[PDB]
Design a protein around this ligand. Sequence first.
Ligand SMILES: N[C@@H](Cc1c[nH]c[nH+]1)C(=O)O
Ligand SMILES: N[C@@H](Cc1c[nH]c[nH+]1)C(=O)O
Ligand SMILES: OCc1ccccc1Br
Ligand SMILES: OCc1ccccc1Br
Lengths: 414, 414
Amino acid sequence: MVETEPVQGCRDFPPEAMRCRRHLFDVFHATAKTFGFEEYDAPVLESEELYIRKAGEEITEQMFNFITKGGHRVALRPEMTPSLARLLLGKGRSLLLPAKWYSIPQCWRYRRREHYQWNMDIVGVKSVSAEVELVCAACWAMRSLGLSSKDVGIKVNSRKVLQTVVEQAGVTSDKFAPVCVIVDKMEKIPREEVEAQLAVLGLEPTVVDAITTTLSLKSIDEIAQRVGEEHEAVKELRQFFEQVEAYGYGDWVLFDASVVRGLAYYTGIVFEGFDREGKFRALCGGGRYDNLLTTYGSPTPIPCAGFGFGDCVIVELLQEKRLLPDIPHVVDDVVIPFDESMRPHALAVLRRLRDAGRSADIILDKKKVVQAFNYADRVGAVRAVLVAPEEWERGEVQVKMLRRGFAVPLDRLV
Amino acid sequence: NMVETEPVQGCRDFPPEAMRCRRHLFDVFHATAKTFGFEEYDAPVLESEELYIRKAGEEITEQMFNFITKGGHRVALRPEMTPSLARLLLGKGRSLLLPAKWYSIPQCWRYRRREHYQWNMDIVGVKSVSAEVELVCAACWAMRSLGLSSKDVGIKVNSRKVLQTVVEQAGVTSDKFAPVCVIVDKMEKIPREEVEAQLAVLGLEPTVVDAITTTLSLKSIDEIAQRVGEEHEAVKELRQFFEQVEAYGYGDWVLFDASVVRGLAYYTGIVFEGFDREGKFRALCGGGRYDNLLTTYGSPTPIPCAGFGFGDCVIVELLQEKRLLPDIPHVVDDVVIPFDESMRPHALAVLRRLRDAGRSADIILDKKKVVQAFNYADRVGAVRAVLVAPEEWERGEVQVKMLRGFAVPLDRLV
Ligand SMILES: N[C@@H](Cc1c[nH]c[nH+]1)C(=O)O
Ligand SMILES: N[C@@H](Cc1c[nH]c[nH+]1)C(=O)O
Ligand SMILES: OCc1ccccc1Br
Ligand SMILES: OCc1ccccc1Br
């Protein structure tokens, strides 16, 4: 026998599991539509060069890469944002801004080795309204799935606070991305180790202390005390919360000075969704990244913000909260030939049902009526349509509702 | 200076314009599957190479995009979906209720294009030709849904059992039958001398090659009946098939062609392929019955199966030629325009309201003047512009303009 299990770290989606994935993806799509985002896609295979950012990111470290027959360095995408940037760079001035682009790529790593990730990005918007919209969209999706502000929230911060603190200590700006990557590890590794890694990057103890203290500040007012009310981060975070409040999602968002995210490229506001019971990893994660397109060679800087929202953590949360009931397969009609001599007539009926916009099966194999009826019930049919010779002479069929029996004229079926 | 903006060799980018076209096609695939009662499934694009080692000289297996993992395992990006389907079915065993009708739209790979999407539809557990009938009707249904007629396209249908008998009657070992089909499939693409030469290499003497050639040239089912008998399975099955399609109302879409064998090793019975009636393009779709495949994978019980693949590239060319792919512009229902920044919070409340009612709506995110906001609304194909101005807001109103503006109460917007 062949190996029936999928390749290591990869998931099969038979119909039962696919209904769940589809339930989630319907919401991603519907939220994107609601918010005016346009769908896009790019190949799962990208040039390895696209991901060589040299900032010690977990995402780039764990790349599923390989060498082609022909010698080119390629990888299965670990994330979508670089692909997005490539596409935008390729369009150049022909791209109308602002642009709001979304996709649901499968992404890879070399435990799980694959996941689907809803991406939403806003391009060409300088102001925090982008971050506001992005954060509102994530919440909207979660609410659409049945979660409340009691179940989840979005922690929000700005990397600019830490940028100032780092820059005020004389630390070269090129070290800032590494600092964020390192400091992101606070939750997952001991503070001694995070401190040790910053030393290796070349930062003296008093600078590491200032970094640590600022991650512990518990309000925007406390940020304002340390760096000034006029500091960009304060201004931007205030606007952000004001706008979310106005949109009516105030209960869903909050400030957290320890949120930096682990990606090199975030320059401004960053955020991540979390379950308020502290049971799961981040539900989604994002931020502003205004320099990325410059680093790729854009002659003009291009503001961007966005987020990724994985398919795995959300499903665990929903299961825990009992918000993923099994969704059984449904079809409107199952057409049942009384016997094989009635199959041609049954096919005409089937045709008619489908032409009217109904989902319909015909029993394909040779079955007795009661077995056909059982099958109809298994596939979750709303209605069984028996095509029998006596009724057919009347220009009729027998109909029976499943969610005992009625003759109906052919023309009145739909 | 700049990252490579082109995608990896042989792979396509789908920016929003191109994605709308793919999505238009995929909507039809999905809708046809739903109409026909098929259930969605999916499996990893990465599969064990062992899954595709069929040793029949198939083009599909020859052109595999395969590579070796760091851990030394032979894997491949799937060249087709049918082996994955079989794996999943084998994995479910007796827990799978039959009949089953499963569909998917996988991206499949090969090493000038290296990548395509392919709608798969398969019926499992149905011994009789009604499966093939349904499959063929579904392909036609999809094509008709896209605007094609029986004047534009058709499905050529045959049975491999005719050739099976002819080959078996000449004393040719049954294990050589799959190779014969693979070779004979090449008739349309390469000279008859070469096809004859390849069969000789497989070990068949000239008179056997003649019998093969003659049977591929038979022009009707009656002529098949003369050669192998009216009671031969193929004749019986093909007659039932055409009778059923006729009854379903798709008789003008289908026809007999004795030269159709397909290039896959595993087809045992009826085979078919869609074609444009102008003779301009390669096959639009292709499929057949494959009743032994699950036995070769190690199923203790034989499991009847039939299905088809329907690629995303040929159909698009046909539709373009026929002027059935008008540019589908991006649409959104509402664009909300703050009169100025002081009106943004109120605008956000309006935006929230619009979206809560099931409408797709943007808000202008950056600072711009009203007429420029109006232009932008028109670019994104907005049905309606909603101006949020201080005077109207005091009235509990906004100004609406369809794409002379007029005032509307907030509650009457939706
Ligand atoms: N690529 C980020 C999410 C994101 C999308 N856009 C901007 N950021 C991640 O994987 O975490
Ligand atoms: N896998 C076949 C199509 C098919 C699906 N099911 C049965 N046949 C192909 O790639 O041509
Ligand atoms: O964090 C999970 C994950 C991230 C990136 C690629 C693949 C996976 Br699975
Ligand atoms: O016939 C085109 C094709 C077949 C299989 C995989 C990838 C492609 Br492109």
